[PDB]
Amino acid sequence: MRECISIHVGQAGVQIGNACWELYCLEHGIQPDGQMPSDKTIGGGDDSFNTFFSETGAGKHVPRAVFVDLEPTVIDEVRTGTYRQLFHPEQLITGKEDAANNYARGHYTIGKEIIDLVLDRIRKLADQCTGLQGFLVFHSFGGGTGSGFTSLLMERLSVDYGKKSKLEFSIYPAPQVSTAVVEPYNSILTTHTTLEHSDCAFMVDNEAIYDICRRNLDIERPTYTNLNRLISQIVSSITASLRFDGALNVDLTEFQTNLVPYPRIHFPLATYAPVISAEKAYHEQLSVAEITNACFEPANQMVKCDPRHGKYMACCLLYRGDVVPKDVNAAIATIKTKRSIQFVDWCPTGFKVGINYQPPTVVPGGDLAKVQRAVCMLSNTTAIAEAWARLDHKFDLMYAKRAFVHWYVGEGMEEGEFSEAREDMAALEKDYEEVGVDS
Template sequence: MSNPALNEIISIHVGQAGTKIGESCCKLFCVEHGIDKSGFILNNHCTDRTGNIDTFFNVNSDSKYIPRSLFVDLDDGSINEIMNGSLRRLFDPRYLISNKEDASNNFARGYYTVGRKIISNVMDSVQSLAENCENLSGFLIYNSICGGTGSGFGSLLMQKLSKQYRKKTKMCFCVFPSNKLASAVVEPYNSILSTHATLPHSDCNFLVDNEAIYGICRNKLDLEKPSFFELNMVIAHAVSFITTSFRFDGSLNVNLNEFQTNLVPFPTVHFIATAISPLRSSSKSTYSNVGGQQIFQECFDKGNQLLSCDIEKGKLMTACILFKGVVPMRDVNVGIESIRHSKIEYVDWAPITFKVGINHRTMDCLPNDIVGRSLLSAGMVINSTAMGKCWNKLNQKFDKLYSKKAFVHWYVGEGMEEGEFTESRENLANLERDYLEMSIDCNSEEDEY
């Protein structure tokens, strides 16, 4: 058995998107570990299914399990909803932090002005959570890089974490701007400013976007007009797959450091796409039953991916598939071979390998879940050169706005220098080039000499 103390992780949820995703994740984690809404182990829950509960929960003297989670928003609306919601008795109110003044979709307000007012309080809370850990492995940060708090305050927080906890792993679950859906016209500014500010400080970023998840809800889960609660439920399942091996013993487990080692071939090329299979509506059947080979194929289907990024238009660098349920290794190997001989292209400078994690627990679902249960399921994380095309599209949107200097005065008015726009854009151009260089075959480079 693994030592649970080796996998203690602190989750930090920033902004409205981050806090809402965090609430959905905590609900699902409680179901998986057999914890009720007050933080106590359910009487009818098998003790051998609680797993390494200390990964995401800290137990107090009353045997109550409290999430190792910090919720932060510059506006108090989302925090008040949590404090008055169904999980109000689960969380420690000391780690629910808000302000009375929001960031108004402005990176500069979250980073330079409003965010600076609470950063000291937030870092004190992080230290308090860290002191309650026997052996802290790292941090999971949840935010949207589209809005003001998630982008601005999220960047400020990442820089502080990098300085204070330099050797700890820092992974992010980020809501990325959608190609066609936008809640604010300045999303390209916020996203590129945030990525520039956090690029050296994050070890791995799992990206999702609302457009892709809307597509999953409509085409896979039979929801014509999904709510944000339902979108967040899909994201929570993706997070569950990624973190299952941290929390439950399995025949093939993947720890926090292994994700970094296997998924990130170059420091800046750390943006990861995520997919889930199978995706079936909970209203159609209690359980669906699919095989390992079908799961592999579905994970590479655009309809199962939580990011609007066409993997087939790039070259696969690394991938990791994480199973829940009993799967024979023969099925896994057949699935890998089927993908190797598909139309997916691969970089030629690395061997074609898939990191595989297997946990024999079947997937858990919430009572009102929109995702149907399956005896065998999997989450896949993919690092592909196709991510460069996502950054290219975002850079083009930035360029159109900045060519007219549109809305720039709102950022400068919060104390940000205009030169930061051009500096950030140049850094993102370098990121694009990094992805392009990753896609160039070694044979092509040799032919040039």
């Protein structure tokens, strides 16, 4: 009925999944085996359990995902580590060769013999999922098999299912973490094919995640065991809103209803409210009204941009922990009085209230806060037109004299598909100016 299947591919899809399924199974209180405690945990109580999970015939719970990666070294961390018995080996697909910073390899020529097995095995999940709610894929822009498999993946589900929506929570690398020189190439070749298939994309940008961990944590080490902590807390916002019966349910089509004014642009922001690292003892637990007064002013370090000079389209908040609803509506009057919040001329409507029950649970060992006040708004702005002007400027000047072009052509790409992808993004950059018109 209300079940859904997420997909976790790539180096930025399993390292996130190693910080999410640990975070999912800590809310329900699930052992590394997967057995259930004696907190009246025999069958589903008042809380819905099988949003991400499944109750097997052996009495325990089985999570449901898609683990596909080309390198066998990453799945060997999963097939040996903490959760080595939650995941059935049918949902553990390993390739042999590598994409190797090449969109052309990961698209089809290594997808020739994996997607015939993936689509065989998500068809296995048809009898184990009577009702589907959609898909949530994790991958990376600008890389190898994260950009390679993703443009293959959306083509083979829209023919099989079609009606089911999908949100991508994608990552392009940073100037601080620059693992390839073709990073503008592999990013724009998967906002080309996926732009006719993606419904909401969250630009989880390492160029601004690392700026948070520089200021709020004072840790200048861009490691994948502390940067993936900050990302998985944002995913945990949407998680309990479809798992636990919150105060106000936000459905998947209902969330897309307010964030997608035109289906062409459909790029909202992951403006999560940044918190402070409490290492031993917090000096002051902030309240609900103190977050949203100064949340989106340092949440502009999520996509490194300037929302204070563009124009907004909408906004949708999502609360975790214990939040009294009458305390919410006092702080919104001050920010509405200010002129910094600038909407379009055709929609001055404020926001949406979404309140859940549980606080964001904390794995020990991390460098984050143990709180119960959590605010996560997810808004869409016309200020990120100049965010894509950076990548097109990083795409124009590796291409005016045709540098690095032969590596894609050497594995099967034509020269026109560059200019096809550029012209499909020069319109999209002008689409935001087309929306933000004072008429």
